[model samples]
Target chain A: MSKQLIYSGKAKDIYTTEDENLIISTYKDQATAFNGVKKEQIAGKGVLNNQISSFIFEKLNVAGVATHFVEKLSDTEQLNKKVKIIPLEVVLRNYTAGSFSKRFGVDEGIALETPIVEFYYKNDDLDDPFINDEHVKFLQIAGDQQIAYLKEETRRINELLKVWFAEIGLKLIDFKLEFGFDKDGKIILADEFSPDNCRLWDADGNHMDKDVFRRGLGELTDVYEIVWEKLQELK
Target chain B: KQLIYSGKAKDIYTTEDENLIISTYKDQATAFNGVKKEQIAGKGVLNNQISSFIFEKLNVAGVATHFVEKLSDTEQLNKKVKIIPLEVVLRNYTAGSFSKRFGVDEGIALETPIVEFYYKNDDLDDPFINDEHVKFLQIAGDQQIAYLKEETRRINELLKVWFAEIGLKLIDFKLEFGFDKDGKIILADEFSPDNCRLWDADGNHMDKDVFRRGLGELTDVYEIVWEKLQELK
Candidate 1:
C-alpha cells in the first residue's frame, strides 16, 4: 500500500502506512544547524544516514534495548513501529563540545571525567531551550518517576555507542536521543541516531559528523559515508 | 582597613580585625549585562539596612551566616569567606527564565519548590547550567553541592514563610555561599531587591523586576519592602 506523508522535519520525512502498526520514514540530503540558521543540500547524504542509523539501531536491538526501528525499506528509508512522539530531546554528552562548550566557556574536545545528560523541550519558537526535571513535571510532559527510567536507558545507549564508535577510531562527542510511547503505552527509543544528530570527532579532532556541514569544513556526505563504510565493514 | 575587592554592586574591605570583612553596598543599578545603568541617591543605604536586618533574623532563627553586625547605613561587618561561584536560585513561583524557557506564563504558582544552579561566568552572560556542568567545570565538590542544596531549601522555606507573614510572596531569589577560615560553608553576599523577586498578594511587583522589565521606579518599591521588613523585630 502507498504511504501517505504525515510529517516533515528538518532532515527527514515521516509517512503513514496502511498497516496501523508501522510508519515509514525517508532521510533527506538537506542539512540545517543552529536552529536552522545554516542550511545545505548534499547529494548522497540520505543513503549514508540510512545506512548509519540502521547499523546503530541494529546494534542497540542486539543489546536488548527497545527501539521503534523494524526494517529498512530502501537506501534512504526505514519502517518503524508507529509511536506517540515525546516532546523532549534527551542529550547525552561524552565529550565537551557544541553548545556545551560555548555555554560553560569550556573548550572543545576535552574528555569529561563523567558524562552529562540534558533535556531540551522540543519547541521551535522557544529555540528548544534547556529544560530541567522541574520543567518536565510543571509542563506535565511526563511523570516524575519516568525521568529516572529515561535517564537509565539514555546512559545505557551512551555507554554502548561510545565503545562501538571508538572501536572504529571515532570519538563520540555528544548526541541527541528521543523516546516515545508505543500503542501499548510502553516507552521505547524513537528517532534516527545518525551523524545529523550526533557530534563526532576523529582522534586528531578531525570532523566526522554534521560539523562538516555546520562549519563548512567539507561535504557532510563524505563524512557520513566514512561512518557508513566502517559500519558496513564490521557488519 | 584596606579595600580587597570591588564588585559590580558592592565593595569589600579588610578590617582592623583579622577575621572580619567590611562590605559596602553601592547605589549603582545595572541590568541585562549592564546595558541598563543608573545611580539612585540612597540605594546603598537601603540595601545595607535591609540585608543586615534579614541576615540577623536568619541568624537568630538557627542559620549559620556571615553576618557580624551592622556598622553603618551603607556598610556591615561580616565574617570573611572564600566565595563559591555558583549562583543558587530557588523558585516558588514561575517568572524570568522559567517562563521563557518552558513557555509558561509569569506569576503562576509551582506545585513544588525548584532549585537552580547557575555558573557565575559574566563573559558568558552567566548562562543556565546543569548539575553535570557543575561537576565537569569542577565548580564544587559533591559534599559542597549537597550543603548548598540543603541550605538553599532551608533558606527557601524560612524566607517563604517569613515573607508570607509580612504580606509578600517570595516569588524567587538568587543566593551565594562561601567557606569561612575553618572550611565551614556559610551564607555569603548581600540579600536585597537586587537578588530577589518579591511581590505583593495582588501581583504587584516589589523587586528588581520593575527595573529589569521597566514596570516603574525601583527605589520606591524597595523603600516599601524595607519598611515592611522592619516589622519582623
Candidate 2:
C-alpha cells in the first residue's frame, strides 16, 4: 500500500493513506527533555520505543481503553487508524523528577504510589503549564464528558501499566502521553512510548531513561537497547 | 466567661469579658495519625516565641493579624475572633503530604502556587476539603473569604522575605484565620518549624516534623532552627 508521508517528529515519522489508516514509523533517534528537544539522541532508541509502545497500547486495549494503534508494522514502526490529533499532551506522573522535585520540597527519588496526571497545552513557549480539570472544561480543549472519560481512562491505563512493569521488575517512574480524536470525534490514545518519553529504572534502581542522557550521565543509547531487550523478553 | 476548647496544638480560651482570646501553647506534635504521648516540654515555648516573632514581623510588614501582645513565652493575648473551621494550606514548593499524595517530586517549585483547603474536623480526621464542600458548609461569609485569601497571599509574601533573610526557604506552610467580634478578619494560627517545612538555600530540610517522622535528627535540629529564627530578631 502506497502511504504518503505527513510529518516527522523527534522520534516518530507519520504517514497518511487514502483509506484513513495512518502509518507511524518509529525512528532510531532517542530524544529527551522537559520541554524542548535535547541535542542528543540515544542509539537504537526508535526500535525500543516502538516495542514498548506496542506493548502498552496492546495492554490498554485489553483493559478497555480506545486507541489508534492497530498493530506493529515493523521492528521500528506501527500501523494506526488516522485521527485528528489534539494539541495537548496529558502526562501522568507516578513518581517525581525534573522540575517537580524542585517545586516541592521533598527528597529526591521519592516514590508516589498514586498517579497524578498533568496537562500541557502542547505549545513549547508556554513551557507546559500545569492545569486542572476546570481549565480543560472551561477552555474547551475537551468537553466535560470527554475530559472525565479521559481522566478515568488515563488513570486505569496508568495503574495497569504500573502493575505490568512491576511484574517485569522495572519501576515506571513517570511518563508523558497524548490522545487524539477519531473521525467520530472520540478521544483515543495516540503517540509512541518507550524510554524516550518515559523514565525506567532497573532492578538495582539504576537510571535508564533519557534523563541520564540529558543530565550528561552517559551511554544512553546502549541503555535504551538494553531496556528494549528486557521488554521483548517479558511474557 | 472563660471557655477553653483544646485542639491539636493550641488551647483556645475565651476571656472573662468575651472581648479577648488567650491561646495557650502546648508541647505536642503529631504525625501519620499518631500523637506521641511524651511531651517535649521546651517545644511549646519555642513555638510560641517563633509565632509571636513572625506575627510581629508580618504586622510590621503591613500584614494584619490578631496578635495583640506576647504575654509570655508560652502564651499570647489577642482580640477574640470567630474562628473559621477551615485550614487554608498554601504551598510554595511541592513537599510533605502533598508530594506523597500527588506522586510528584519533592522540592519542585510549582509554576503557579497551589492553595488547598482542609476541613478542621477533629472527628473525621480533618479531611482534605474542596471548594464545593466549603461553599456548601457556608461556615464563612463572602467578605471573610475574600479577606482570608488576601491575607494569606500577603502572609506568604512576608514569610518568604523573612525566611530568606534568616537563611531558610519557606517551602510551604499551613494557615488559618478568624473573624473578630466586630466583623474584622485577622490571621490567627501558629507559624513555626512545627507548622512549616523549612529548607536551607541548598534544599536541605531543617524542620521538626521530618525529625519526628524518624527521617532525621530531632531535638538538636529543632534547636538549630530556633537559633536561626532568634538571629532574625
Candidate 3:
C-alpha cells in the first residue's frame, strides 16, 4: 500500500498508509531538555529510540495495552497501524529530579518509594499545565474507557520499565508518553521513547540525553548516539 | 455602605448589593502585624500588576483563585470569601527566616516541599501551627484543610516551573487560600514580591527583602523584574 508522510516532529517522521496505519520513522537525531526540546541529532540516535520503544512496547503489550507498534521499519523507524492520537502526555515520577525536586524542596536524587503519575495537556501555549481526572472528563479529550486505560496502563508500563531499567543498573528517572486511538476506538500506546523522551543519569550522576543540553554541556549528538548504542546491545 | 472586617493589610467595605470592595492599602509592606510600616514608592502599582498577572496565569492554568478584578492601582473588586483564620505557607526551598529558625543550611534546596500552617493570631505573635492544631482549633473543616494542602501542592508545582522557565527561581514562598460562599476552596490573597522570595539565575535576591536588608535601589530592581515579566506575556 502507498504510504503518505503525515507528520514530522523534532525526532520522528510519521507516515499514513491507505489502510490508516501509522508508520513512524524514529530518527537518529537525539534531542533532550527538561523544560523543552533543545539539542541536535546524534548519528544513529533514531535507531536507539526505536529499539527502546520496541522493547518496552513488547513488554507493555504483554501487560495488556494494545499498541500500534507492528515492526521496525528500518534501523531508525517503526511501522505500525495508525490511530487517532490523544493530545496529552502522561508522566510518572518515582524519583525526584528537575523542577519537582526544586518545587517540593525535596532532595534532587531522592527516590520516591511509590510512583506518582501526573497528566499534562498537550498545549504548549499554556505551558502544558498539570491536569486532573476531572479536566480529562470535562475536556472530553479521552472517553471514559480511554482515560481509565491510560491511567492503569501508564502505571503498569512505568512499573515494568522501572524494574527493567533497574536490572540494567539505570534508574528510570521520570519520562513522558502519549497515546492514540485505534480504528476500534480503543486506546493504544503511540509515541517514541528513548533518552530523548526520558532523563537518564548514570550512578555517579553524569548527564545523558537532554539534561546535558539544557545545562549547556555540548556534544548532544554524540550523547544521543551513545545512548542508542547502549540500548541496542540489550536487544 | 457596610463594614465587614478589618485585617492587617486590607479593610473590607460592602455595598448595598452585598458585593465587596476590598480597599487595599498603599502601605506597601508588612511586618509581624501593623507594627512595622514602611512605604516604598510605586509598591502599590507593582503589587497590583503582579497579583493580576499571577491570578490570570493561574486561571489559565486551571486553578480557581479569588481575584475578581483590579479596581485601582492599589485595590481590587473581589467576591468576599469567608477568610479562614490560618496562613498556609508552602515552602519550596530552604531560605528566608525559616533557614535561620530551623538552623538548616541557607540556600540549600529541599528534597520535598513542605506545607506549613500558621495560626493567624496577631496577638499571640502568629505562632507556628501544625495540622493537628488546625484540627484541634476547628479553624477549617477537615475537607477544606485537605483541599488547601492539595491545591497548595498543585499551585506550587505550576508556579515553580513557570518562574523557572522565565529565568527566575522561586524560593520558599507563602500562599493563603479562602473558602467561597458555595463552600468551594479557591486560592486567595496576593502573590507578588510582597509574600515571595524570587532569585535570578545566579541566585540574586529580587524582592522586598532587599530593601529590608538596607539595599536602597530596591524599587529599581523590582521595576526591572516587573518589566521583564511583562514582556513575556
Candidate 4:
C-alpha cells in the first residue's frame, strides 16, 4: 500500500499504511543532541538503528512486554501498531550519566543504590523540562495510577534489558522511553530503542552509545555495530 | 551605619558586635517574585512582632535559631549567619504554589509532609529545585540535604502544634537556614505571616495571602495573628 507521511520526528519519519491500525516508521540518518542544538546527517546510520531497534524490540515482545513494534520491513523501515503518542519522556537510570551526572555534579558510571526514574515533559518549547510527579498531574498527562504503572513497567523492562546487555558485556547505564495508548486504551511501549535514546558503555568504560556522537569520541555507527553484533551472540 | 543587605521585607545592618546583625523589617510587601510590590503601613511592625514571638518559642523549645530579641516595633537583633541561598519550603497541607502546581484545591491535608527547595536567586526568580539540583548548585551535600529536610520537618511539628493551639492550621511555610560563625547550619530568616500560610477556623487566610490574593487588609490579619499568638502558653 502507498504510504502517506504522518509524523516526522528528529530521527524518524512515520507514515500511514492501508491498515488503519498500522504505520510505517523509517529511521533516518539524522543525529541530534542537546535539544537539537547539534545536528548531523551520517551515511548508513539509518540501517543500523532500524536493525538494532528491531532486534531489541523483537526480544522484548518475546519476553511478553507489550510493545508497538510489529515487524521489521527493511534496512531502514519497520511496521508498528499505530497509537497516539504520549508527551512524556520516561527516563530510567541504572547508573548516573549524561544529564544525570551533570545534574548532580557526580561522575558518570556510578551504580545507583536504587534505580532512579525521572520524567520530562515532552515539550520542545520548554526544553523538555525535568518535572516532578505533581507537575505531570498538573499538565493532565497522567493520573496517579497511570504514573505508578509507567514506573513499574519501565523498571520491569530495565530488568530484562540490563541482563541481556550485561551478557553482551555492555552496561546499560540509562535510557529514555515513550509509551502510548493503544486502540484498546492500554499503555504499550512505543518509540525506537537505539543508541539515540540511551547510554551504553562497553567493557572498558568506552562510550558505546550516542555519547560517541555527543562527546565527539569517534564514529557513531562503529559503536552501534559492535552493540548489534554483541546482541546477536545473546541467543 | 553599614547596610549589610536590603531585601523585600527586611534590611540587614551591621551592629557593633561582629557576631550579630540587626534585621530591620520594612513596610514593603512583595509577591510573585517581587513583581507586585507595595508599602503597607504597620506590616513591618506586625511581622517583626509575630516573627519574634515564634522564634522565641523555637528558642525555648531548644531549636537552634538566629533570633536574639525584639529591639523595637520593626527591628530585632539576630546572630550573624552566612545565609545559604536556598528557600527550604515545607508543606503540611496543600496551598499557594503547591496547590497551583498540582492544580489541587487549598487545605487538602497531605498524607506525608513534603519538603522542597528553591534556589534563592532573585535573578532566576527563585526556581523550585530538587535535592539533586541542590547538590548541583553545591549548596549542600547529601548528608546536609537530609539534615535540611529532617530539620524542616521537625520544625513543622512544633509549628503545627503551636498554630493549632492558637486556633489556626499551619498550611505551608518557607524557611531559610544558614551557617553561623562556627559553620554549623541553623535556622535563620524571620518566621512571620509574610513567609507562611495560616488558615483560621473559618478558613480565613491569616497570612501574607491576604496581601497576595487581595483578600483584605494585610496588617489586619497579621495583627490578629500576633494577638492570637499571645494567648499561647
Candidate 5:
C-alpha cells in the first residue's frame, strides 16, 4: 500500500494510506506543552501512549461512541479515518486542576458540583485562546445545533471515562478532546486520549498524566505505563 | 471647586458637601472603546434629563442609587462614590456586540437574561471578564458579585416594564455600581441612551448605536427616548 506523510502534529505524524478516506497515525515520543513552548523527547513515550489511547478508543468504539479509531497496527501506530478537524478544543472538567485552577484562583483537586465544559480555538498562532459559545459561532466553526451536540456529546463521553477511571482508582480530573468531520461530514471523535491531553490522579492524589512532564513530577513514561497497565484491568 | 474627574460622557466637579458631587454631561459621543468620537450639540442635555429621570425612578422604587437632583440643563448632583471598576452588562435580547459575538441577526429574544461583566479599564480596552476574573482583580467578593447580579436583574425588570409602557423595548444595558461614603455598594454612574440599547416596536435602534452606526441624526433619536421616558409615570 502506498503511504505518504500527510500531517505532522506535536505528538503524532499522520500518513495517508492507499484508501483516500483512511490514514495511519504514528504516535511520537515528543511531548509538548504550553503551545509547544515546552517540548521534550522522552524515550518509550510514544509506544506507551499509543497503547493507552488505542485501548481507550477501542473501548469507546465498543461503547457506541462514534470515533475514528480503526485498529492498532503496531505498538506506536494505529489506523484511523481521515477527517477535517473542527478547530475547537472541546474540554470537559470534573475537578479543578491545571489552567482551570489558575484561571479561577482555586486549588487543585476541588470537585465541581456539575461538570464544566469549555472550548478553546485550536489555532497555534492565537495560542488556542479560551472562547465562549458566541465566539464558536463567530468563527463559523459550527452552527447552533452542532455546538449543542458537541457539549452534550462531550458530557456523555465524560460520564463513561469518569466511571472507567474511577473503577481503576484514577480520578479523571479533566481532558481535552478534538472532533473532526469525516468524509461524509459527520462529526466523530478524533485524536488520542492518553495522559498527554488529560489529567489522571491515583487514589493518593498523585499526578499520573502529562503533568508528570509539565510539573516535573517524575519520569513521564513510568506514570503512563502505570495508566496503561491500570486501563488493561478494565473488563 | 475643581473638576474631580473627566470622563467620556460626563465630568465630575466637587460640590459644597463632601458627600455630594456635580456631574456635567458632555456633548461628546464615543464608541468602540472610545476609538470613535463625535460631539453632538444636544447630547449632554438630553442624557442629563434622561439619566436623572431614570435614577429618580430607581431611587423611588427602593433601589439604592447615587442621584441627588438635576442642577441644570446638563448638570446633576449625585452622591460621591468610589466607583467600582466594572461594567455589569445584562442582555434582554440579541443586539450590538451580542449580535456580533453570536453571529446572529439583531432582535432574537434570549430565553433568559444574560449577565456579563466587563472590567472598566480604559487602558485595557474594557475586556469582557467572568465572575472568577472579578475576584482575581480584587474588584468584588463572592457575596458582592452575587448582589450585583441580582440587583441588576431586579433593575432590568423595572426598566423593561417602563420602556414597554412607552412603546420601547429594553434590549440590553450596562450598569456601574460603587461603594458610597459608608462603603455600601449602591448603583452609581448614569444610565441613558449613552449606555443602554433600546429598540422601538418597529425594531429601531434608539440608543447610542445611532451614533456608533452613523444611523443619521444622533440627537433626533435621543430626544425621542427622553420624551418617551417622560411618559413612564
Candidate 6:
C-alpha cells in the first residue's frame, strides 16, 4: 500500500495503496450525529465499529452479496477494495423512527408490513436531503441499469440484515448504506455496517444504538460495548 | 352543464346532461393560502383565456383533457369530474419550495424530469407523501398511481416542448386529475399561469410565483402570458 492519505471522513481515514484497487481505512474513535454538529471521542468505539463492519461484511459475502471489505489489519483499521461511490444513500426502514417519525407523524417503534427503501442524495453540503427515483435519474447520479442493480441489491441485503440482526435480539429498526461501482462497473456494497449507521433497538423496544448517544442517554461507547457483547452471544 | 357551485376563482354551473358543466372564472387572485389576496380587474378573463388555449393545444396533441370549447374570456367549459384532491406536480427545472427542500439553487436543469405527489388535505398543509402512503390513504391503487405518473410525465413532456416553442420555459406545473363518467382518468382543472411556473428565455417569471415571490405585479406578467397564448392560437 502506498503511504498516501486519500480521504478522511467523519469516522474514518482512508489511505491509498500501491495497488490501485485497494486502500487502508482506519476507523476513528470519534462519534458524530446531527449532521456532524455533535462530536465526541469514545475510546474503543472505533475498534468495535471496525470489528462489527468486518463481521457484517463477511456475513454479507457468505450470503452472496459482494462487498468492499478485504481484511482486518488493526483494531481500528481494515484493508478494502477502492471503488467510486455513487452519490446516493439507500435507506431501509422496517419501523418508524428518526426523520420518518417527525415527517409522517408515525410513532417510532411501529412495525411496517413491508420494508420501505428510501433514497437521499449524498451531498454533505446539502445535508443529503430525501429524494425519489426520479430525482435519482434527474441528477444523473446513476443510470437505469445501476439504479436497478442498487435497488435489487439493497433489497437482498435488507432481508439478510433484518433476519441476522434479529438473531442477536436486536430489531433492525432502520439503516443506511452506500454503494459504489468498481472499475469493471459492477456495483457492490461499501461503507461500514455498525451501530453508528443503524437504528437498532433491543427486543424490548429499548434504544441500544446511536440514539443512546444522539439523545445523550449515557456513555455512548459503553452502549456499543454492550452491543458487541450481545453480538458475541449471537450464536 | 348544470349550474351549482362556486370556488374562490371559478363558479361552476350544472347542465341537464350527465356530462356537462360550465366553469366561469372570477377576477380574483389569492396566494399563500389567502395570506396575499387581490382582485385585479379582468384577471380571471386572462386566466380563462390562457387555460383554454393551452388545453385545446394539449387536446390537439392527443391528450384527453376536460376541454370542450372556449365560449368567452371568463367562461367556457363542457366537462366535470370527481376532482382528485391530490396536487400532482412535475418539475422540468428546480425552483420555489423544491429548491429550498433540497438546498438546491433555483433554475438548475434536471437531467430527467421529476414527479411529486402531495396529499390534498389543506389541514395537513398538503403534506408530501410517497407511493406507500398513497396506499395507506386509499387514494389510489398501484395501477392507478402508475397511470397517473405516466400521464403526468407525458403532460410534462408536452408542456415543456409546447412552452419552448412559444418562447417560454415550462419550469414546472401542478396538475389535478379525476375520474370521468366512464371511470377513465382525464386531465381536469385549470391549466393556467395560476397553476404553472413559467418563465421567458431570459428568466422573466410568468406564473403565480411572480406574485408569491413579490417580484412584480401579477396582472402584467399574466397578461403577457395570455398574449403569448393568443399568438400560439
Off by over 4 Å in 4: B1-50, B53-173, B176-189, B192-233
| lDDT tens digits by residue: candidate 5, B1-233 | 79999999999999889999999999999988757998889899999999999999999999999998999999999999999999999888888777655456888887778887888988766776665557656899889998999999999999999999998999999999999999999998999998899999888899988888989799999999988887778
Error of 1 at A20 (Å): 2.9
True contacts kept of each: 0.75, 0.00, 0.00, 0.00, 0.00, 0.30
Give the per-residue lDDT of model 3 (tens digit) for A1-235.
Answer: 5766778676777776566555655565656454454555567556666777777777677777678778776777677877787878887777778766643445777777666666777775555655555446544697667776787888888877777766655777888888887888777788876776677776877667666667777666576666655654555
Interface RMSD computed for candidate 1 is what? 1.4
lDDT (tens digit, per residue) of candidate 3 on B92-207: 77786566444456677766676777777666556665443476557876677778888888999988987787788788777877778787778777788777888887877788
What lDDT is obtained when candidate 1 is compared to the true structure? 0.88
Candidate 6 C-alpha lDDT tens digits along A1-235: 3679899899999998888998899999998988989998888889999988888898888888999988989998999989999989888888989887776666799887877777889998888888777778777798777777887888899898888888888899999999998878788889899998898888777777889988988888777887788777754
On TM-score, the candidate that comes out on top is 1
5 against 6, candidate with superior TM-score = 6
lDDT of 2 by residue, B4-38 (tens): 77866788788776778887888876665556544
Compared with the true structure, all predictions reach lDDT values of 0.88, 0.72, 0.71, 0.89, 0.89, 0.84
Q: Write the per-residue lDDT of candidate 4 for residues B27-92, one digit (tens) a residue.
A: 999998767899999899998998999999999998999989999998899999998899998888
User: Per-prediction DockQ scores?
Assistant: 0.69, 0.03, 0.04, 0.11, 0.09, 0.43
User: In candidate 6, which residue ranges exceed 4 Å CA deviation?
Assistant: B1-42, B68-80, B83-85, B98-112, B127-138, B161-165
lDDT of 1 by residue, B1-233 (tens): 79898888899999888788999999988898878988888989988988998899889989989999999988999999888888999999999988877778899888888888888878988888777778877878777787888899998889988889899999999998888999889998988989999989899999888988899888899999988988875
User: What tens digits encode model 5's per-residue C-alpha lDDT throughout A1-235?
Assistant: 5899998999999999999999999999899878878889999999999999899999999999999999999998999999999999999888988777766556899887778788888988767777766567656899889998999999999999999999999999999999999999999999999998889999899999999888898999899989988898996
Residue A76 C-alpha lDDT in model 6:
86
What local lDDT does model 5 show for residue A27?
Answer: 93
In angstroms, the error of model 6 at A49 is: 1.9
